[PDB]
């Protein structure tokens, strides 16, 4: 166990920046949590180990892909001048945690009161409201999350063309992934947190500005992270408050073990499909900018091999909840029926 | 509540037999259980109330159907002489409870040790072994349960033709039921018990000789009776020992309420599909003879009406367990996956 407490190195020693510009960050900028973590590997695109982790659907930080090299010059001023006049979704929160919720599922749970509110805005309005909160020492927090579409300026389109499509397109092909579905632009304030959740798509997480601490958990820790019901607005998100974990309701969160890393400008983090991930912008680190690359996952293989992988059971559990909500005619009857199936029978 | 304790009349006063032959039975012949019961209605075939109970799939004892009138002369001697030389399944038990188990499902649960053993035998061998146990004051118990097939003697075939097919065929048609699948002949010793279970078929339960106490529970008490897992050999049977109920494992058995009656020669009990039923041959009442009529249930209606009836949810729960056992590739993984879906999520 002595070697275990040491193997839980977190993100390791902060990287030292070229030109002797000091540590990119310090441990004090990271929030404190209850669980141990390991470092995610930081490797080169050409390192065969990095290739072995991606094909095996394990996370890895790639340091030299140049995936978004043209975008590393992006700041609020540059984007305000060239990202066009399209509408940008901007969530507002009283807290540092920006829990994702699906608006379309809010009807099923009318008792659910979100603490993040979405608001369409022009990017210059976001920079303005961003500047106001700063100038007034306000505790309000903002987090821009917008899919990049046709309504972006020419130079932003030229930056896009300058992405390393040769590299990522080859990755898409070698893993059999589906189409690229979107690129989510992410501009958040220091201290912002996206609580733990998993996505049903493969993700290349390309950091542009600022630093983000990424804590991942493999799909086989489903039992420890307690996602919301599938029909709940917070489907795929963890119910556990990482800041105040309730071990009475979530006892197995005391067995969670994460994979952790801090990405900075130029880093690309492969967040494999179904992998949980907790994203937080370093405290007192300024704004963070990121662009992700969401790809549909490979199809289900013709022949199924047993035993099933953890992510396959997650797919099964999700589908069970879905069709029961469909068959019962009401999502809120899924819980009672399942309990009826279990109590005194399987527990 | 005063009127409730009185409304739980059990099987009511024992019937008095024609010709002043005394009470057909006395309360002391009935085993004692922990739950209250109501009387099932005893009505005439021509009573419109009886028609309303069958169409609404509620139990009812019909007193004058003549469904098996030619079979009311049946005894061990008559059957031994005319039921042919076919093989007859005869379960043997150290106890009065003859819990049904599916032999084909015993592979999935190799830790399951049945206490009833099936044995193919000629009917004269059954009468012989029956006579031996008596002559030796043995505690062994037998229960013949055999589907009636082509290998029965001519007179037994003539008795069959003499059944009131006009009446039951009309019932089959007016309820939209499927085909008649089988007629199970049942010859058991006094005190024999078939513990609580439900069948996926409609059943007309035609008593021939002796008396049987039938305790039924509607499908909406699924939560109180705790069937075994679908893949367990005792699928569709209750896990609760009615003689020693374990309220720690089966807490809701303290809310069970049954419908009860004692049928005798000439009575026909409609046991609706999915309805639980506990069958016991009256103590010190001699052998019992019964022939049931199992019909496939009506198809699923084109348009589904919500809310779903209890039996529809039972159909859903059964199918969920089935496809999970199929998808997971192992029945014994159904429990863990369901618990994973529930704990901290729906409970």
């Amino acid at each position: 166990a002595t070697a275990a407490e040491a193997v839980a190195s977190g993100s390791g020693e902060p990287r030292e920046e070229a030109g002797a510009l000091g540590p990119a960050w310090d441990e004090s900028q990271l929030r404190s949590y209850s669980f141990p973590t390991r470092p995610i590997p930081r490797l080169s695109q050409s390192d065969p180990r990095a290739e072995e982790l991606i094909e095996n659907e394990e996370p890895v930080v790639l340091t030299d892909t140049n995936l978004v090299y043209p975008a590393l010059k992006w700041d609020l001023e540059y984007l305000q001048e060239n990202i066009g006049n399209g509408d940008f979704s901007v969530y507002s929160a009283s807290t540092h945690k920006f829990l994702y919720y699906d608006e379309k599922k809010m009807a099923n749970f009318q008792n659910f009161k979100p603490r993040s509110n979405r608001e369409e805005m022009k990017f210059h309005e976001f920079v303005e409201k961003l500047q106001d909160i700063q100038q007034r020492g306000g505790e309000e927090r903002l987090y821009l999350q917008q899919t990049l579409n046709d309504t972006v300026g020419r130079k932003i389109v030229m930056d896009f063309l300058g992405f390393n499509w040769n590299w990522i397109n080859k990755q898409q092909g070698k893993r059999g992934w589906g189409q690229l579905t979107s690129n989510l632009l992410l501009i958040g304030m220091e201290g912002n947190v996206t609580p733990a959740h998993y996505d049903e798509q493969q993700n290349f997480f390309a950091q542009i500005k600022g630093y983000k601490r990424c804590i991942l958990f493999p799909p086989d820790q489903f039992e420890c992270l307690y996602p919301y019901p599938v029909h709940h607005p917070c489907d795929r998100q963890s119910q556990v408050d990482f800041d105040n974990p309730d071990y009475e309701r979530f006892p197995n969160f005391q067995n969670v073990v994460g994979y952790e890393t801090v990405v900075g400008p130029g880093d690309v983090l492969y967040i494999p499909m179904y992998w949980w991930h907790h994203i937080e912008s370093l405290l007192n680190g300024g704004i963070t900018i990121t662009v992700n690359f969401w790809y549909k996952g490979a199809p289900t293989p013709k022949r199924i091999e047993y035993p099933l992988k953890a992510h396959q059971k997650v797919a099964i559990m999700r589908n069970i909840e879905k069709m029961l909500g469909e068959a019962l005619g009401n999502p809120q009857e899924v819980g009672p029926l399942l309990n009826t199936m279990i109590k005194g029978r399987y527990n | 509540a005063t009127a409730a304790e009185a409304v739980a009349s059990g099987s009511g006063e024992p019937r008095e037999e024609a010709g002043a032959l005394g009470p057909a039975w006395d309360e002391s012949q009935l085993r004692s259980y922990s739950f209250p019961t109501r009387p099932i209605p005893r009505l005439s075939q021509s009573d419109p109330r009886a028609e309303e109970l069958i169409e609404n799939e509620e139990p009812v004892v019909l007193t004058d159907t003549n469904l098996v009138y030619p079979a009311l002369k049946w005894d061990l001697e008559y059957l031994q002489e005319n039921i042919g030389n076919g093989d007859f399944s005869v379960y043997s038990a150290s106890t009065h409870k003859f819990l049904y188990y599916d032999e084909k499902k015993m592979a999935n649960f190799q830790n399951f040790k049945p206490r009833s053993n099936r044995e193919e035998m000629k009917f004269h061998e059954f009468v012989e072994k029956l006579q031996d146990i008596q002559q030796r004051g043995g505690e062994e118990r037998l229960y013949l349960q055999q589907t009636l097939n082509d290998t029965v003697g001519r007179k037994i075939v003539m008795d069959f033709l003499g059944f009131n097919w006009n009446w039951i065929n009309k019932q089959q048609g007016k309820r939209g039921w499927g085909q008649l699948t089988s007629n199970l002949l049942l010859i058991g010793m006094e005190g024999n018990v078939t513990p609580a279970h439900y069948d996926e078929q409609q059943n007309f339960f035609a008593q021939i000789k002796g008396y049987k106490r039938c305790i039924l529970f509607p499908p909406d008490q699924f939560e109180c009776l705790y069937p075994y897992p679908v893949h367990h050999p005792c699928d569709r049977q209750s896990q609760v020992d009615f003689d020693n109920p374990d309220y720690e494992r089966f807490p809701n058995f303290q809310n069970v309420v049954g419908y009860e009656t004692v049928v005798g020669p000439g009575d026909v009990l409609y046991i609706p599909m999915y309805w639980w039923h506990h069958i016991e041959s009256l103590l010190n009442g001699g052998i019992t003879i019964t022939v049931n009529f199992w019909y496939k249930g009506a198809p699923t209606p084109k348009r589904i009406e919500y809310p779903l009836k209890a039996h529809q949810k039972v159909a859903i729960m059964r199918n969920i367990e089935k496809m999970l056992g199929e998808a997971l590739g192992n029945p014994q993984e159904v429990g863990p996956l369901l618990n994973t879906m529930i704990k901290g999520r729906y409970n």
């Binding site: 699906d102 999350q145 589906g178 579905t181 795929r236 199924i304 589908n319 | 496809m323 199929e326």
Partner: peptide, 19 residues
């Protein structure tokens, strides 16, 4: 069709609100 394939089919939902 195949019950196993029906239950194994993955979705494609991500943390991006749909319009």
């Amino acid at each position: 069709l195949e019950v196993v394939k029906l239950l194994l089919e993955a979705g494609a939902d991500v943390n991006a609100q749909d319009k």
